[PDB]
RNA sequence: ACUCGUGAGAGACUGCCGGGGUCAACUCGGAGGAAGGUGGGGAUGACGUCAAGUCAUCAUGCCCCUUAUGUCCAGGGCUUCACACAUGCUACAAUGGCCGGUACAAAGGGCUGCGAUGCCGUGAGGUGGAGCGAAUCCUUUCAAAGCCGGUCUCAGUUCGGAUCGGGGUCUGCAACUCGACCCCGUGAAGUCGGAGUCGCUAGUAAUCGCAGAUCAGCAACGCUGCGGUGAAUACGUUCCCG
């Protein structure tokens, strides 16, 4: 079922299917399912249309997900970069920003290993 | 071959000379070299007649080869270390050409530890 | 970060300095030495010469960097590459 | 270690007993209850005005004679090096080598 | 009213000697006892490195063992009390009177 | 083992089947000391085999063992400073050990979505003589035969 | 009455045997609420099986220390001792079965320099 | 009465029997016994070697500094990163992940310390302070693996948790460089690892949790101990090492 432009998994339990929304993990899905009132164990092929609508308007109401969240994160990172703070140039040169050791580790920020 | 040199104190140019001299030993080794480390140290006491100490360690396909030398300067220590390493690698070869004279030969002439024991019948030859 | 009950932390030296600085609405460069002090909305226009370990680097405050520390804007270690 | 640093540790202790006993503790009691009016009281600022050496956070358990700052034992106030030597000489009552 | 007599010493023979001598004197004064009830031994263990520099793998262990005996009397006649505060004991053993 | 053979551990008979070999099997499938899970897996496999065939599980398990039990195995021997593959006769205990180890491993590499079903299928196919352990016994016997020239030492 | 004890690697079992039925009372819980493992039950009842006195002794037991396996072993030793106290002339049958022997296998003390009792830290020659 | 705690003592000595043995050492088997052949594990490390390590625990000959190489302070650094090596932890999953219920330890620590009941938070935690110098009170009455039930269905996934964004708690004068923990979101590599190489013979390896020292806080996945569950294999010294 198309939910906020997200093609839901074909057969999954409700909360874990909702996890596939970029702004929702497991706790968010659980609490929104409990609050709105849908069953949490029922498969994604059992949704009726009005269920899709109630999920849609609830999510657009008291949550921010998908493109807006991505662009807000990108804008926050860019603003942090442009003010010249430590995390700024840490983001600029692709190095860990939370004080992680860089003598050996931090291949996640460094990407794949290169030989020079 | 790639070598990392861990010197100490003051030894200008010792690292490069040791690198270039040791890297030439790869062809002498009959098996691929997995690691090669060299350390240069100098004795603080001026009373030492040979203050500079050079040590090397090569991982010749799991077989550890090491040597240690003393000299009056970096160049002499590196050269003597190269000589000792060459001698050790010569004694380690273990390929067939290096162990063809030690394999037991003949049938009854000569005995070695691993020589094939003579087959004996049950009854005394008589 | 610092707990909310204690409130933000600012050293008294540059505190009195900025209070006497903004009382006559003129903002000259202030030479400072407490990199641990948070940015307060009273700094919005003042220019700080925050220490680095060797010298003082000018820091011109804005609305964006309020709530941070003067220390984030004086990078200590210098690295250019291998 | 160094005589100056052995002495300076003691000077911190006499500073601590003089200041941290009531001055650097009543301010903490003020800051604990959110009900207590800390913000206008400047108990934070008043306690900043106090010397750093008042704070016990600057103290260091050194060896009581040797001055060794590391490998310290709170039961004896002695370094690991000194405890080993005096226990072997039978100087600490009721201490001996172990087996089990 | 009964009072607790508590012994703590690092040496077994010393605390046993004090316990027997104390029951002897209180029985001399004519008091009812319970006997030197044994209590669990307290063990404090410390591990140290032998060498001053490096050599972490070589360690040395020590303990301090404290032995406890419990003495409880009855019928606290004043003569027993006056005897109790008039007892000389080895410095190793302490007494707790409650 | 330089000073002589070491004594063997006399493991106990199983309570719910009364056979030594099922205990040997549970000890072979044991991992990290989780013995309860190992016995559950083995018992489930035996019950699955009983349900599929309709007879006692111990008899078909023994049939599988005899189907995968090897007799001739090859060890490298250095005689007179030269090494060759020499076929060697296998003692009964070692043959049982090898058979059980092969069964357990080759069941671990099956594709039946659960260890119990994999093990049950492997024992059934070994009983009928189609399992991969039976194959492995075929290859080890083939290698033993192909090197029969070196059997004289 | 009669009372014996069983000990197995930090597990202590006090047993009280009376000639009633085969009811097993382990700290107020039955042999099924306790010890939910068939192997443990067989280990428990083995002395009764070899003595063939199954279901003729009501058993009351006190369990403390160790885990389920140690508790079961100590309990089995406890019933063996209780049986040897009740009917002395069965001592051959229990003893040759080993049920009269306390198992002196305890956790080996951890040693300094080693990660575990015998496990040694990984050593790199290169 | 039974455990238990801690004092004393007994108990393994080839003591006995049978056989090999030079009738000698010693050895094989059996009985008794909790234990049988230095029972298991510790402490204990000969003469010396390697001018091995330590003038940075300490002491010390000689040399050197002494308006400084002494001494006080603030800030920074010891945490820098294109890489290389080494020791570990977490994984790559179904012998598993998640949720609910539920059973069993030992050892140790605690006075300006342990800190309970209760109340407030979702959770770090906050308020509050019962009782404890402690076989008593607190560390929960102590565990986790375990057992039972439900769900997931072989996928880079309900695996894996890195990295990153936001929001907080605590300690501390102060968490920017540079603490730990909590919540929401984010969801990387990783499909069992080449040459080569390491540890371990029984309560051992493997696996699970607990505690202590240092310590205001912690970089602790480290070290030193404690208990829970608990294997496989050893034909035999030709080869490798000492």
What residue of G is the nearest CA neighbor of E56? G113
Phi-psi region of A110 (alpha: psi -120 to 50; beta: other; left: phi over 0): alpha
Nearest-5° angle of CA B46, CA B7, CA B27?
120
Q: Which CATH architecture fits E1-98? A: 2-Layer Sandwich (3.30)
The rounded distance, in Å, linking the Cα atoms of C1 and C67 is 11
Determine C/D contact with 3+ CB pairs under 8 A as the test: yes
E81 touches E27 (CB < 8 A): no
Q: Which domain holds residue C73?
A: 1-82
Determine, yes or no, domain membership for F74: yes
Per-window interface: G 33-92 vs F, CB < 8 A: 37-39, 41-42
The rounded distance, in Å, linking the Cα atoms of B5 and B41 is 11
The rounded distance, in Å, linking the Cα atoms of C49 and C54 is 12
D55's CB contacts (< 8 A; 6+ apart) are D16, D20, D24
Nearest to C44 by CA among C60, C26, C55: C60
Determine, yes or no, domain membership for F2: no
Phi-psi region of E3 (alpha: psi -120 to 50; beta: other; left: phi over 0): beta
A40's CB contacts (< 8 A; 6+ apart) are A13, A14, A15, A30, A33, A34
Q: How was this structure determined?
A: cryo-EM
Give F7's DSSP letter: P
Q: Which domain holds residue A90?
A: 72-116
Nearest to E95 by CA among E9, E1, E3: E9
The rounded distance, in Å, linking the Cα atoms of G86 and E56 is 57
Got the DSSP string for D40-79? Answer: HHTHHHHHHHS-GGGSGGG-----TTT---SSEETTTTEE
Cα atoms found within 13 Å of the Cα of residue D90, Cβ hemisphere only: 0
Asked if strand H comes closer than 7 Å to A43 Cβ, the answer is no
List chain G residues with CB under 8 Å of B59. 126
DSSP H helices in chain B = 14-23, 74-92
Asked if strand H comes closer than 7 Å to D18 Cβ, the answer is no
User: SS3 letters for C4-71?
Assistant: CCCCCCCCHHHHHHHHHHHCCCCCCCEECCCCCCECCHHHCCCEEEEECCCCEEEEECCCCCCCCEHH
Determine, yes or no, domain membership for F120: yes
Got the DSSP string for F55-76? Answer: S-HHHHHHHHHHHH--SEEEEE
Which token pair is F76? 């490298």
List chain G residues with CB under 8 Å of F35. 39
What are the φ/ψ torsions at residue B76 (nearest 5 degrees)? Answer: -65, -40
- Please tell me the total count of domains within chain A: 2
CA distance G92 to chain B (A): 50
The rounded distance, in Å, linking the Cα atoms of G114 and G121 is 6
- Please tell me the total count of domains within chain F: 1
- Please tell me the total count of domains within chain C: 1
Residue B6, H or E segment:
strand B4-6
Q: What crossing angle do the helices spanning F20-29 and F35-53 adopt, rounded to 10°?
A: 120
Q: Specify whether A64 is located in the same domain as A89.
A: no
Asked if strand H comes closer than 7 Å to G95 Cβ, the answer is yes
Resolution, given in Å to one decimal, reads: 3.5
C-beta neighbour count of G83 within 10 angstroms: 24
Asked if strand H comes closer than 7 Å to A16 Cβ, the answer is yes
Determine D/F contact with 3+ CB pairs under 8 A as the test: no
Burial letters G85-118, b for 16+ CB under 10 A, else e: eeeeebeeebeeeebeeeeeeeeeeeeeeeeeee
E2's CB contacts (< 8 A; 6+ apart) are E72, E73, E74, E76
Domain of residue F52, CATH code: 1.10.455.10
Per-residue CB contacts under 7 A with strand H, chain B residues 3-22? 4
Asked if strand H comes closer than 7 Å to D2 Cβ, the answer is yes
Pairing of strands E59-72, E37-49: antiparallel
Question: Tokens 């369990």 — which residue?
Answer: G63
Per-window interface: D 38-57 vs C, CB < 8 A: 38-39, 44-45, 48-49
CATH classification for the domain delimited by G1-126, as one of 3.40.50.620, 3.30.230.10, 3.10.129.10, 3.30.390.30? 3.30.230.10
List chain F residues with CB under 8 Å of B116. 79-81
Which token pair is D57? 């956070």
Sheet holding G58-64, edge to edge: G3-8, G11-18, G58-64, G24-26
Cβ-defined contact of A83 to C64 (cutoff 8 Å)? yes
Domain of residue A81, CATH code: 4.10.910.10
Cα atoms found within 13 Å of the Cα of residue D30, Cβ hemisphere only: 18
The rounded distance, in Å, linking the Cα atoms of C43 and E34 is 79
A59 touches A32 (CB < 8 A): yes
Which token pair is D60? 């260091």
Which token pair is G14? 């006090």
Helix then strand count (H, E) for chain E reads: 2, 4
Which token pair is G60? 């009351």
């Amino acid at each position: 079922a198309r939910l906020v432009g997200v093609d839901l998994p074909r057969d999954k339990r409700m909360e874990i299917a909702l996890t596939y929304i970029y702004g929702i993990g497991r706790t968010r899905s659980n609490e929104i399912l409990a609050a709105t009132g849908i069953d949490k164990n029922m498969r994604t092929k059992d949704l009726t249309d009005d269920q899709v609508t109630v999920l849609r308007d609830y999510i657009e109401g008291n949550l921010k997900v998908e493109g807006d969240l991505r662009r807000e994160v990108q804008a926050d990172i860019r603003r942090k970069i442009e003010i010249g703070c430590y995390q700024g140039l840490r983001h600029r040169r692709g190095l860990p920003v939370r004080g992680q050791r860089t003598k050996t580790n931090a291949r996640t920020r460094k990407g794949p290993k290169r030989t020079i | 071959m790639d070598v990392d040199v861990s010197t100490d104190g003051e030894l200008p140019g010792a690292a490069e000379y040791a690198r270039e001299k040791i890297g030439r030993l790869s062809r002498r080794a009959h098996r691929p070299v997995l690691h090669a480390r060299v350390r240069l140290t100098r004795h603080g006491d001026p009373a030492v007649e040979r203050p500079v100490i050079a040590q090397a360690n090569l991982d010749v396909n799991g077989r550890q080869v090491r040597a240690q030398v003393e000299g009056v300067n970096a160049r002499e220590a590196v050269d003597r270390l190269e000589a000792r390493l060459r001698s050790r690698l010569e004694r380690i070869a273990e390929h067939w050409e290096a162990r063809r004279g030690g394999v037991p030969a003949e049938a009854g002439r000569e005995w070695r530890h691993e020589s094939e024991p003579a087959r004996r019948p049950g009854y005394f030859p008589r | 970060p610092r707990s909310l009950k204690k409130g933000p932390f600012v050293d008294d030296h540059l505190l009195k300095k900025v209070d006497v600085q903004n009382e006559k609405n003129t903002k000259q460069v202030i030479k400072t030495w407490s990199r641990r002090s948070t940015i307060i909305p009273d700094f919005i226009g003042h220019t700080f010469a925050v220490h680095d370990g060797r010298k003082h680097v000018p820091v011109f405050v804005t609305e964006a960097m309020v709530g941070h520390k003067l220390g984030e804007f004086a990078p200590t270690r210098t690295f250019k590459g291998h | 270690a160094k005589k100056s640093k052995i002495v300076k540790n003691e000077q911190r202790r006499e500073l601590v007993q003089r200041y941290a006993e009531r001055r650097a503790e009543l301010k903490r009691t003020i800051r604990d209850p959110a009900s207590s009016p800390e913000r206008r009281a400047a108990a934070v600022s008043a306690l900043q005005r106090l010397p750093r050496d008042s704070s016990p956070v600057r103290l260091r358990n050194r060896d009581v004679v040797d001055g060794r700052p590391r490998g310290h034992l709170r039961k004896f106030g002695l370094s690991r090096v000194r405890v080993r030597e005096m226990a072997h000489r039978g100087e600490l009552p009721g201490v001996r080598k172990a087996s089990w | 009213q009964k009072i607790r007599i508590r012994l703590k010493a690092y040496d077994h023979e010393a605390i046993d000697a004090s316990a027997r001598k104390i029951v002897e004197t209180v029985t001399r004064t004519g008091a009812s006892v319970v006997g030197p009830v044994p209590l669990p031994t307290e063990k404090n263990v410390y591990c140290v490195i032998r060498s001053p520099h490096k050599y972490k793998d070589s360690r040395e262990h020590f303990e301090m063992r404290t032995h406890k005996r419990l003495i409880d009397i009855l019928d606290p006649t004043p003569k027993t009390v006056d005897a109790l505060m008039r007892i000389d004991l080895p410095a190793s053993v302490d007494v707790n009177i409650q | 083992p330089r000073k002589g053979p070491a004594p063997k551990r006399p493991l106990v008979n199983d309570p719910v089947y009364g056979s030594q070999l099922v205990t040997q099997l549970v000890n072979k499938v044991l991992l990290e000391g989780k013995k309860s899970l190992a016995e559950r897996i083995v018992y489930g496999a035996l019950e699955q085999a009983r349900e599929k065939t309709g007879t006692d599980p111990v008899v078909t398990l023994k049939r599988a063992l005899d189907n995968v039990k090897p007799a001739l195995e090859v060890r490298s021997r250095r005689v007179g400073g030269a090494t060759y593959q020499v076929p060697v006769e296998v003692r009964p205990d070692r043959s049982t050990t090898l058979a059980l180890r092969w069964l357990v491993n080759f069941s671990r590499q099956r594709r039946e979505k659960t260890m119990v079903e994999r093990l049950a299928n492997e024992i059934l196919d070994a009983s009928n003589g189609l399992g991969a352990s039976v194959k492995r016994r075929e290859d080890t016997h083939k290698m033993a035969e192909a090197n029969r020239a070196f059997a004289h030492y | 009455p009669i009372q014996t004890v069983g000990r197995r690697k930090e597990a202590v079992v006090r047993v009280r045997l009376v000639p009633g039925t085969g009811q097993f009372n382990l700290d107020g819980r039955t042999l099924e609420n306790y010890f939910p493992n068939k192997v443990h039950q067989q280990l428990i009842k083995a002395p009764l099986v070899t003595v063939d006195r199954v279901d003729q002794f009501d058993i009351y037991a006190h369990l403390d220390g160790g885990g389920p396996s140690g508790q079961a072993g100590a309990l089995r030793l406890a019933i063996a001792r209780a049986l040897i106290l009740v009917q002395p002339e069965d001592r051959p049958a229990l003893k040759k079965a080993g049920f009269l022997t306390r198992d002196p296998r305890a956790i080996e003390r951890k040693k300094y320099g080693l990660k575990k009792a015998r496990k040694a830290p990984q050593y790199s020659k290169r």
